[PDB]
Each structure stands twice: as structure tokens, then as C-alpha cells.
Write a protein that binds this DNA or RNA. Structure first.
Ligand SMILES: [Zn+2]
Ligand SMILES: [Zn+2]
Ligand SMILES: [Zn+2]
Ligand SMILES: [Zn+2]
Length: 1229
RNA sequence: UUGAUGUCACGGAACACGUUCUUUGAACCAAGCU
RNA sequence: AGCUUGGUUCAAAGAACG
């Protein structure tokens, strides 16, 4: 009597499943339950077992069929086959106890009254509705749909992952609230099966109505569908426990966070395990990758060997399997590192019936959404915790572009067109505003990418404005999808008006011009797509012929029918009636930097082959399916520097300098850059370099103030991008500014003043600007006709005032031609170190302080050695490969050059000037290896205990930055900075003003830009036991080691030893260098800011000395090398953002103010000043003091001078050694 | 695994807000031993 | 008392969210 119809619904996109509900909570008052009534249900065994399987109720399929029937009946005027249909009853007002009621209006196709209840006959629509006049057999019964075969799964997480969906405010730009739903991918569970039992009494017209309605229902359970009718993951955890043991067995545990983040960095990197940084030699002993070897213990295997074995486990050879290994392994190491809203409907009564436009055109726009920038789509996994900001991925690990986001962006874009937001709330009858009306005829197909590589991790920090450094707890990372990912776009509009609505045409035209800001993190230039290859064709559903094959083809919704429909679509997009300009304008930036640049990324260097401590940031492009790296300045960093430039200028208001909470603020910074509640109107993109600049490595060593030698464990390097005045690094990007800001006169001035400051070199880009990195030569914003760019036109009053002459030197040194002087002496510091006064922050430009640039002219007196240690094999007479990997070859070096230009690194000049500044102001030994324990054949006390606590480095022990040392910061820690406080002076690279003059003529006469080698004597580390004669408590640290000036380099140039006079021989322990002669002129520029009157004076007095002194620079200082002179050429002071002025006339006041502080500091107890002056005293006239180190024994010195064995018991015995080493130019004879 | 004369949930952008940055001369002569 | 011979440092201190 009843026939069963086989129906299978297949989902074309991920569908949504409501979560399991208890029968108690399945009531009508459950907001979460009723919200999920349109979603698939999860059948779960009752008590405590989430094991079960999903299903779709037949009631949901029935209601979806009813809607299609109304739409089909409206399109046919109710004339199905040959008989009419009434509008239906839709009342059931007997009790109204039925979840739930129909809020939307019912479509009206006829004015006839509904069929009377209990009538002997019913129209086809009433037969479909199930109206009736165990005998209650359904006229048409819809059975539930289940997975084929009724499988069983562990729980809802086995099939789908819960996702959070938010509602973003239109004006604020930030989300009011959110709701979560299970998303079950259609690629794993595409098809459902069910039954529709039809009684034999059902009319053929009702059967035709049911079949047509089934072929019309295109969306069920939140997805586009077509209804038809007729031991495994344990490897990554065993490796994790092995690593934690190996780290534990070797102490460590501080590298786990770097190892967790670096191993996870190998997620894309099955082939990257083979290429790892390795040690400084080729020995293969890395401080991170070779932790567990422990001097060749059989039970010990290094972390490198652990991963190499994992790289070839016979199952991780697949890319996907390997990727989940690193994620699981990295996420496991991370855990060890740490350890050690549902809108509701309203029960409104009988819904009004509306005779909507029976024309009902159908429009399909097919295209590709192409990522012009990196994008970011939400979706934080509640299990994964090694990343703070994750991206939405499919279970296949493909990048997903949800229709929930695309629906929201179209809704947001439609509102901007109309200039009217939509204030309708969730619940009640549908909103009838222009935006909601267009969005109810819109269908957007959910999309995924063919590209499958893992996301990049970007590390973002919040900088403390006052301290100039990273704030406490401001390090966080995010997953970023690459540029160039193309998503297949499917837009489908259905409405009465022919073609797309007028607003929809413009928003699609906005998107076509690369102005689709689809994803989140838009402030940092993430999520700008362009709709490409758009096509469209309208379908007239009212036409019987066109509507008939529409049902037969299932609307061409499935992948089989799309290409057939795609042939009909014509290329392009309809021209909007009244096109409106998009609300965002693109400003093209062009920055030029005449210095090296580094935008740091520690994790990428932990995995890089070069092994450098710091490397520059690189992003990836989705070049098809394989990603390619590219060096770029981070958009997050560029926004941060530009935001800082604006904020430090402005005092809004009365008179904080834009450093407020911004909780309830109407701030120039808040409403240009955005707040936590007020998403900004400026969108910075990544900045990329014009050419392909290959990174270079620069070695850095922190010298000890006491021993003058390298401080242990503080030898480092980094791989910045090379730049210079010969080859500036042209950085080219964009930022997007909204209409309401670019048309605002004050914002153009606020941005223009800041961009002028950046133009004036006031804001270096990236990190390590203290040593001359990322100095901006210029900055052009040549988009944006006039407006902002008009303020980037500085005027410098170039009144030619000569810089004051250097004062004559008071220092008097008497040198005898028959004595021999020790190569170095110690300037004993004053007992008082002025630790006051809690230095000024970097958050403003304080009144009274001075900011500007000091142009200096350094000149060499003795030959100068500044080596390029990147190539210690420079001077080798061919046969290079013969001693490669020998580990004992003679080391050779060339002078530092950047892009084939002789230069002095700012780090070199910075320490050389810093050392003199520290002694002049009696500051602490900024670098001092305190932990070293002296042995006298052993001390019971540390070396740092010898000196006073005042001389101790200031860093040594939110408010920890200024509370780290109770006493505070010494004068040179204020100026040159600490780890916790950023320095106020930046030392640029010094460039050779003229063609070089070399100490030794070059081997090839053709090239005058290279010099010959000079072989130095052996250079050995300093012995503090000589300075501190014994373990006696009386003996203390003598003071700052300084190397006197002398001409022992003349003996070395001839090849003779400085002391014995015997010719030096090549050995595996002495160096060969290229040294400039005397007379080479270098210009370098010192940028400072917020300098006091005296600090700028002491700096000048430290930079330029008195007439008759000199500086010591480079290596071989004890051999008379690297005597240099600095003359301050010009002082330019930043009066304001637009006007700069000269201080060439104000120089003598700075020197006077500086010395007055010296007199106040020490009250004419300045013996260290004169002692330093004697040490700095260059030998004037014809006098040639003989300076050298004693030999071990007198018999080893052909000149007859005694040796260390004789001196050790002679005049330098035990108690005359401290006094004879702290007195400059005292001879040991 | 749902009831049935009423399901706009394609009715809802995981959105907004953060500079991998701060400091550090590639430098350096007297001990080691029974 | 016995004569002469030897390279060192290769990252560190922080920040891992308000
Ligand atoms: Zn009827
Ligand atoms: Zn609305
Ligand atoms: Zn503000
Ligand atoms: Zn200090």
C-alpha cells in the first residue's frame, strides 16, 4: 500500500552538525539545541560513550522540500501538471506546541483559500504537506538519513572539528560575539541514505511535486547538496621522550623551547634534517643539534641522529606523514618547555504571505579568488598549543576559504556601498534592509586550495615604548597562509530583478580590482584577494523550458555539471549602474637604506645551514603548488615603526603623548591605526626589496673591559641583508588608507609629519640599529597625490659655521729612548660610579634634550686592522683545497668590505668609542666575565668579587627592567644601553672617503683597491693572574686595560718580532691581515636622540679627543696598530619634524656643559682622566717609545732585556706590579 | 536516529589590537708541569 | 730545583601574551 523511495543526499561542501544533547536539554527552551535544528545530528549511545554516528532527520528534509515546493509553485502559479494548489494551511494553532514556528513569510501564488480540513480530496501541495482528514500512516513519510552501512566512530571529533563563528560589528570592525558548530567535511562523508515512504493513494501530481522539490532543494545542513532518488601515532611520542631524556641527561632544558619551535619548523622539511646548521667548524658539534653526544657515549645519541633516523623510518618518507610527525614532536617538546551567542527565534503567529516576484532569475558568477597577500582565517585548534594564531585548514591540510567568511565579507562590503549598516538582531522575521535582501538571494560555494604546504609561523612582539625593548610577555606567533593561493570562487544570486543587484555589481567590481579584504589580520596586510577570471550568466527560472532542465541538472551544483554550466558563462562581470569608488586607497611606499638590514627570525637561523645566530625574515609564495622564499620587511614591523613615528610626535591631549590605555579614547593613534575595539583605517603590507639581496654574515665579539680580550661565550654573528651608499637597499611596498582618513586634513598631517621623521633617518627599520643597521636614507609615498606627501620636504638651514677646533692636550708623557714600555696599562677607575638617574624613555622627544646626527671624520695614524673574518683563508698562495678541512691551516684575513667598499662596521666603532666613554664617566665595566675563577697553582672567590660593586655591570643583580639593579644604570649604560634599556645612540658604518692607502702594496699592481698581507706575531689571551698577582684579598682588579700608542708596527711590517726582533714565522696560531696605512680618512655618522647637554658633550669629548691624543681600533693594538683620530665635522640638531639646525656654533657649550658634570661628579678627583689621556697620548714629534711584551726568560730575548721569569721576581714581583701596571708608560726596562 | 498543516541558520567574517626586539670592537702574552 | 711551551671564546642575559 506504501512505496519506499530511495533518496541519497550528497554534500558538495562541509556540512554542519549540532552537538549531542541530553533528552532533558532537548526541550524548546534550549537555545543551543534550537540553533542547531537546521544542522545534522549526532547519534550517541546514552550513558558515557561518545561512540556513535551522524544523521539528518527527515523532518529537516521535509521542511527543505516544503520551501522548494513553494518556490516552484510560485514560479508556476500553482499550476502543477494540470491542477491548481492552494497556499496551504501553515497554522496548527490548536496548541502551538511544536518546535519550531516559521518566521519567514510564506510565498503566495494564489488567492484561493486553503483546502478545508477533513476534505475528501486534497490539492497536490496538501498531499506533500501530509494533511489528513496504528491507522495514522503518513501520506508521505520522510525517514532519517544515515551514513551508508551505519559505521561507528569514536565521537564527533572523529568526523568533524568544532569551529567558532563570530558576528563582526560593521562600524567597529570587531566581533560582537560568536557561536561554534561542528563542520563535517564532505570529502570524508559525502553521502547520506534514507527513505521516503509514499502511500499508494498519493496523487501523481503530488509525486511529481515531491520529485521536483527534491531536485530543487540545493542547501541542507548548511551545505550545498544534491538529493538523488530512485600503534600508528606512537613514533612521534617515543621520539619526544627520547629528546626530553637527552636534554635532561645533559642538563640543558633551556634549548627545548628553541628545539620545540625549530623541530616544528621542520614540519615542511623532510629533506631539511640532512641540512642543519652544524658547528662553527665542520666538526659537527652543534650547541643545539648535537647536545646529546656526551663525548662519545654508546648510550648517547645526538638529537641530529634521532631526527635523521626518523627521517627514514619507511613511513615518514611521505610528506604528509612526516609533517604530522614534526607537529606532534614539536608540540610535545613545547609542553615540556612550559612544564619545566546562539541567537534564538521568536514564536510569532501565522506568517504573512507575500507574492514575491515570480520572474526569479538565477545568476551564477564563477571565478578564482587569488591571494595577493598572505591571508589568515581563524580556526584555533583547542588541542594544538604551540601556536597562538592558527589558520583554518581542511583535514586534508588544504587551505580552506569558508563561505561563512565570504558571506560576512560580502555583507560587510554591501553595507559600505549603501553607507547604511544593518542593525537587525538574530531572531524574528527576516530583516528587510537592502543588504539583507541581497544576501538572502546569495549562495557562495565553500572552497579549499590545491596548495598544501604547511603555514609559516610569524613571530610578533609588542615593544615597550619607554624602555625601547620588547615588553614582558609580548612574544607571540601566528600561522600565515602564503600569497598566490587561488581559491575557486562560486557566487550564485537568485532574485526577481534581472542580473545581479546594483550594489552587488559594484562589490564584485571592487573585488575584481584586488580590493577584496577577505580574511582577518587586515591591519597587517593579511587577506587581500582579487577575483580573477570572473564569468556570469543569468538563468530565467520563470521560463518553463529553462526551469525544466534546471531541475533535471540539479542546478549544475555538482562537480559533474559545473563545467557544462561553465561553458555557458561569458567572460567578465556586469558593469554596475552607479559605480561607487572603493573605500580603501593604495599608497605606494619606497624606502631607501644605505646600511645593512636585518629583520630578525631566530627560529629560521636554528635550522639554516649557515648556522648564524640571527637571520633575516623570509616569507613564502604559493608559486603553483611549491612555495618559494623571499626576503621582505615584515608588515607587522613596518606598521609598528610607522605607528611609533606618529605616536611620539603627538600629545593628545593635555598632555599625554599618546601612551594611554585607549580603553575609551578618541585618539589620533586609535582612530588611524585602530585599537582593541576600533579596528584601524590603515593597512600596512609586507615590504619587499627591489633586487635579490644575498645575506652576509658579520662576526661580533664582546671585549672584556678589564682583560681587553674576548668575553667568554659572547662570540656571535648574524646574517643581515647587505646595504651601503654604493648599493642602497631599496624597499618597496604599499599600505592601504581609508577614504575618511585620506580626506581628513589632520590625519594627512599626522601621517606626513611621521613619514617626514622616517624620511629624516630618525626611525631605523628592523633590529640592531645601534650598530648601523636599517638606517633610512629617504622615504617616498608617491601614491596619494599631495595630501600626506607634501610634508616630506625638509629644509635645513646650511649656514656655514665652522666646527670648533680641537683643544690642545694637557697630557704630558716623557719617553726615554733607552727604556722599554709595557704594551698596555690599566686606568684605575674612580671609586664612585654615578648610577643615577633612571634614564629617559624612548617614547617621546623630551624638551631640552638634543636629537640629531653627528658627522665625524675618522683618520688613521698607525696602520689599521679591521678584518673580515667570514673568510679566514684569504692570503693563501694557491692550493687552497690542499689544506681545506685541515683544522690547522694558517689563518688569513682581509679588511672589512661591504659591496666591495672599505668600511668600518658601526659595532667596531661603537665599542671603541664606548670604551673611552665608559672610562671618562667612570661607568661600569659593561662587559666583564665575572664567573671566571682565577687559579694561582685556586682562588676561593670569583674574579668579579675583586672589584667594587659599583664597577659591576649594571644589568647584573613589568618593573624588572628598571628594578633589575637597585642602584640603577651607570652613565654609559644610559647612553649605550643595557639588555633591558635600549641605547640612545646609533653608530653607522664608516665609509672610506678616498681611495685606500695600504700598509703593504698589493701583490697585483693592477688593482689599487687591495693591499698586501702583513703577518702578525702570535696573539694570546690576557692573563689576569699577571694583573692580579695572587689569591691575596688585597689584590684587586686594577682597572680598564688600554693599549698605548707606539710604532711597533714598523718592526712587524719588516717581519720582525716586536720584542725579540727575530723574524716571525708562519704557524697555525698567528694571523695574516690586510691593513690600511696611515692617512686613510673615514666618515661615519652618529645618530643620537634625547641626549642631555653634557652627554652630547662627553660623547664629543670621547669621540674627538684633545689635540695630541688618538684612539685605538681593530686588532693588534699591543703591536701599535689601529691608532685613529676623530674630528667632529658637523652637528645637525632636529629642531622639529620639518626644521633641522646646526650645532657647529653650539659645540663649545656642549663640551663646557659636559666637563661641568665631570667636575660635579668627581670634584676634580680626575686622575683617571689624565691617566687615560696619558694612555691615549699619541707620541708627538720624533720620539719613538719602545713598547713590547717581555719574553718568558732573559735568555730567549736577544736584546738582553729580562723576561717574565726575571720580572716576576724583579720590579714586577708581587706588590710593585699593581702600581707599575696602573701607572701609564711605566717601563719594565 | 525525526515526526509531519509552519526550521530565513547561505540569519552571524574568529574579528579587533601588538616593531623578534634590547646590550655586546673579532678581539686578545705569561703561565703549564713534577 | 727542572726547561719552554701553549691557543681561547662560537652565544650569552631577557622577553614565550595584556
Ligand atoms: Zn490544498
Ligand atoms: Zn538587514
Ligand atoms: Zn588614543
Ligand atoms: Zn653600567
Amino acid at each position: 500500500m506504501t512505496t519506499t523511495m530511495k533518496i541519497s543526499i550528497e554534500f558538495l561542501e562541509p556540512f554542519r552538525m549540532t552537538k549531542w544533547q541530553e533528552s532533558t536539554r532537548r526541550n524548546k527552551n534550549n537555545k543551543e539545541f534550537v540553533r542547531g535544528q537546521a544542522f545534522a545530528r549526532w547519534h550517541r549511545n546514552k550513558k558515557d560513550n561518545t561512540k556513535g554516528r551522524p544523521y539528518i532527520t527527515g523532518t529537516l528534509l521535509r521542511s527543505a522540500v516544503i520551501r522548494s515546493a513553494e518556490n516552484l509553485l510560485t514560479l508556476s502559479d500553482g499550476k502543477i501538471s494540470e491542477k491548481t494548489c492552494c497556499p496551504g494551511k501553515f497554522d496548527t494553532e490548536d496548541k502551538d506546541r511544536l518546535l519550531q514556528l516559521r518566521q519567514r513569510s510564506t510565498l503566495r501564488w494564489t488567492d484561493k483559500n486553503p483546502c478545508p480540513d477533513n476534505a475528501e480530496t486534497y490539492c497536490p501541495f496538501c498531499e506533500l504537506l501530509g494533511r489528513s482528514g496504528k491507522d495514522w500512516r503518513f501520506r508521505i513519510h520522510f525517514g532519517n538519513l544515515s551514513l551508508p552501512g551505519k559505521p561507528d566512530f569514536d565521537g564527533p571529533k572523529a568526523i568533524g572539528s568544532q569551529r567558532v563563528l563570530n558576528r563582526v560589528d560593521f562600524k567597529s570592525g570587531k566581533a560582537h560575539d560568536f557561536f561554534k558548530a561542528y563542520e563535517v567535511d564532505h570529502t570524508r562523508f559525502p553521502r547520506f541514505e534514507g527513505e521516503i515512504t509514499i502511500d499508494n493513494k498519493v496523487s501523481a501530481e503530488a509525486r511529481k511535486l515531491l520529485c521536483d522539490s527534491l531536485k530543487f532543494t540545493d542547501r541542507l545542513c548548511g551545505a550545498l547538496c544534491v538529493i538523488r532518488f530512485d600503534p600508528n601515532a606512537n613514533l612521534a611520542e617515543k621520539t619526544a621522550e627520547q629528546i626530553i631524556s637527552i636534554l635532561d641527561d645533559n642538563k640543558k632544558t633551556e634549548y627545548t623551547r628553541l628545539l620545540a619551535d625549530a623541530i616544528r619548523s621542520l614540519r615542511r622539511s623532510s629533506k631539511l634534517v640532512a641540512g642543519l646548521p652544524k658547528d662553527h667548524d665542520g666538526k659537527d658539534d652543534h650547541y643545539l643539534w648535537d647536545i646529546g653526544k656526551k663525548k662519545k657515549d654508546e648510550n648517547s645519541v645526538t638529537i641530529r641522529q634521532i631526527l635523521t633516523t626518523s627521517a627514514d623510518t619507511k613511513e615518514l618518507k611521505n610528506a604528509g606523514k612526516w609533517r604530522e610527525f614534526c607537529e606532534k614532536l614539536g608540540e610535545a617538546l613545547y609542553l615540556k618547555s612550559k612544564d619545566m551567542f546562539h541567537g534564538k527565534p521568536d514564536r510569532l503567529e501565522k506568517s504573512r504571505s507575500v507574492s514575491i516576484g515570480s520572474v526569479l532569475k538565477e545568476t551564477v558568477v564563477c571565478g578564482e579568488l587569488v591571494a595577493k597577500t598572505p591571508f589568515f582565517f581563524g580556526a584555533i585548534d583547542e588541542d594544538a598549543k604551540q601556536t597562538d594564531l592558527q589558520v583554518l585548514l581542511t583535514p586534508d591540510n588544504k587551505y580552506r576559504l569558508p563561505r561563512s567568511a565570504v558571506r560576512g565579507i560580502l555583507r560587510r562590503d554591501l553595507q559600505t556601498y549603501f553607507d547604511s549598516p544593518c542593525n537587525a538582531e538574530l531572531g524574528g522575521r527576516p530583516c528587510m534592509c537592502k543588504t539583507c535582501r541581497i544576501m538572502r538571494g546569495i549562495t557562495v560555494m565553500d572552497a579549499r586550495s590545491e596548495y598544501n604546504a604547511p603555514p609559516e609561523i610569524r613571530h610578533r612582539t609588542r615593544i615597550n615604548p619607554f624602555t625601547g625593548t620588547v615588553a614582558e610577555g609580548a612574544l607571540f606567533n601566528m600561522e600565515v597562509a602564503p600569497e598566490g593561493i587561488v581559491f575557486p570562487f562560486q557566487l550564485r544570486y537568485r532574485g526577481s530583478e534581472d542580473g545581479l543587484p546594483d550594489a552587488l555589481k559594484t562589490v564584485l567590481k571592487w573585488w575584481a580590482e584586488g580590493q577584496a579584504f577577505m580574511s582577518g589580520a587586515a591591519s597587517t596586510g593579511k587577506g587581500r584577494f582579487r577575483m580573477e577570471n570572473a564569468k556570469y550568466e543569468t538563468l530565467d527560472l520563470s521560463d518553463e523550458n529553462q526551469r525544466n532542465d534546471y531541475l533535471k541538472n540539479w542546478g549544475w551544483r555538482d562537480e559533474k555539471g559545473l563545467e557544462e554550466l561553465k561553458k555557458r558563462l561569458n567572460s567578465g562581470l556586469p558593469e554596475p549602474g552607479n559605480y561607487r569608488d572603493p573605500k580603501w586607497h593604495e599608497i605606494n611606499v619606497s624606502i631607501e637604506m644605505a646600511s645593512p638590514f636585518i629583520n630578525g627570525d631566530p627560529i629560521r637561523a636554528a635550522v639554516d645551514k649557515r648556522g648564524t645566530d640571527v637571520v633575516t625574515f623570509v616569507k613564502y609564495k604559493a608559486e603553483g603548488e611549491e612555495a618559494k622564499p623571499v626576503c621582505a620587511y615584515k608588515a607587522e614591523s613596518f606598521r609598528g615603526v610607522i605607528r611609533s613615528a606618529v605616536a611620539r610626535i603627538h600629545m593628545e591631549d593635555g598632555v599625554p603623548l599618546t601612551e594611554l590605555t585607549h580603553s575609551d579614547c578618541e585618539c589620533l593613534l586609535c582612530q588611524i591605526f585602530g585599537s582593541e575595539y576600533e579596528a584601524g583605517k590603515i593597512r600596512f603590507e609586507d615590504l619587499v626589496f627591489e633586487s635579490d639581496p644575498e645575506p652576509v654574515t658579520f662576526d661580533h665579539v664582546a671585549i672584556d673591559r678589564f682583560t681587553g680580550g674576548a668575553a667568554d661565550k659572547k662570540k656571535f654573528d648574524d646574517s643581515p641583508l647587505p646595504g651601503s651608499p654604493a648599493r642602497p637597499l631599496m624597499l618597496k611596498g604599499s599600505f592601504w588608507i581609508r577614504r575618511d582618513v585620506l580626506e581628513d586634513e589632520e590625519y594627512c598631517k599626522a601621517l606626513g609629519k611621521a613619514l617626514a621623521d622616517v624620511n629624516n633617518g630618525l626611525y631605523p627599520l628592523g633590529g640592531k640599529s645601534a650598530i648601523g643597521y636599517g638606517q633610512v636614507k629617504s622615504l617616498g609615498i608617491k601614491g596619494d597625490d599631495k595630501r600626506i606627501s607634501r610634508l616630506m620636504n625638509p629644509a635645513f638651514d646650511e649656514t656655514d659655521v665652522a666646527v670648533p677646533e680641537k683643544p690642545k692636550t694637557d697630557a704630558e708623557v716623557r719617553i726615554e729612548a733607552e727604556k722599554v714600555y709595557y704594551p698596555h696599562y690599566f686606568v684605575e677607575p674612580h671609586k664612585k660610579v654615578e648610577r643615577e638617574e633612571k634614564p629617559c624613555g624612548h617614547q617621546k622627544f623630551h624638551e631640552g634634550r638634543l636629537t640629531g646626527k653627528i658627522r665625524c671624520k675618522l683618520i688613521t695614524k698607525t696602520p689599521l686592522i679591521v678584518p673580515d673574518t667570514s673568510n679566514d683563508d684569504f692570503f693563501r698562495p694557491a692550493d687552497k683545497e690542499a689544506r681545506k678541512e685541515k683544522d690547522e691551516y694558517h689563518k688569513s684575513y682581509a679588511f672589512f668590505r661591504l659591496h666591495k667598499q672599505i668600511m668600518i662596521p658601526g659595532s667596531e666603532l661603537r665599542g671603541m668609542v664606548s670604551s673611552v666613554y665608559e672610562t671618562v664617566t667612570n661607568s661600569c665595566f659593561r662587559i666583564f666575565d665575572e664567573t671566571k675563577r682565577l687559579s694561582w697553582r685556586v682562588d676561593d672567590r670569583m674574579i668579579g668579587k675583586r672589584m667594587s660593586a659599583d664597577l659591576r655591570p649594571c644589568h647584573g643583580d613589568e618593573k624588572r627592567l628598571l628594578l633589575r639593579h637597585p642602584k640603577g644604570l651607570c652613565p654609559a649604560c644610559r647612553l649605550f644601553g643595557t639588555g633591558s634599556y635600549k641605547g640612545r645612540v646609533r653608530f653607522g658604518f664608516a665609509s672610506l672617503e678616498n681611495d685606500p692607502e695600504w700598509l703593504i702594496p698589493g701583490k697585483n699592481p693592477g688593482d689599487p683597491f687591495h693591499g698586501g698581507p702583513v703577518m702578525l706575531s702570535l696573539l694570546e689571551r690576557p692573563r689576569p693572574t699577571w694583573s692580579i698577582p695572587g689569591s691575596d684579598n688585597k689584590f684587586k682588579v686594577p682597572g680598564r686595560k688600554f693599549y698605548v700608542h707606539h710604532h711597533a708596527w714598523k718592526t712587524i711590517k719588516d717581519g720582525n718580532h716586536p720584542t725579540t726582533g727575530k723574524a716571525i714565522e708562519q704557524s697555525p696560531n698567528n694571523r695574516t691581515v690586510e691593513a690600511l696605512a696611515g692617512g686613510n680618512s673615514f666618515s661615519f655618522e652618529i645618530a643620537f636622540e634625547n641626549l642631555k647637554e653634557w652627554e652630547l658633550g662627553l660623547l664629543i669629548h670621547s669621540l674627538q679627543l684633545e689635540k695630541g691624543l688618538a684612539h685605538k681600533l681593530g686588532m693588534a693594538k699591543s703591536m701599535g696598530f689601529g691608532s685613529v683620530e676623530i674630528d667632529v665635522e658637523s652637528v645637525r640638531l632636529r629642531k622639529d619634524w620639518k626644521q633641522w639646525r646646526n650645532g657647529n656654533s653650539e659645540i663649545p657649550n656642549w663640551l663646557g656643559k659636559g666637563f661641568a658634570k665631570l667636575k660635579e661628579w668627581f670634584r676634580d678627583e680626575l686622575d683617571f682622566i689624565e691617566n687615560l689621556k696619558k694612555l691615549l697620548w699619541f707620541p708627538e714629534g720624533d720620539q719613538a717609545p719602545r713598547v713590547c711584551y717581555p719574553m718568558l726568560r732573559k735568555k730567549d730575548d736577544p736584546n738582553g732585556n729580562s723576561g717574565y721569569e726575571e720580572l716576576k721576581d724583579g720590579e714586577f714581583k708581587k706588590e710593585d706590579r699593581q702600581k707599575k701596571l696602573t701607572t701609564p708608560w711605566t717601563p719594565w726596562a
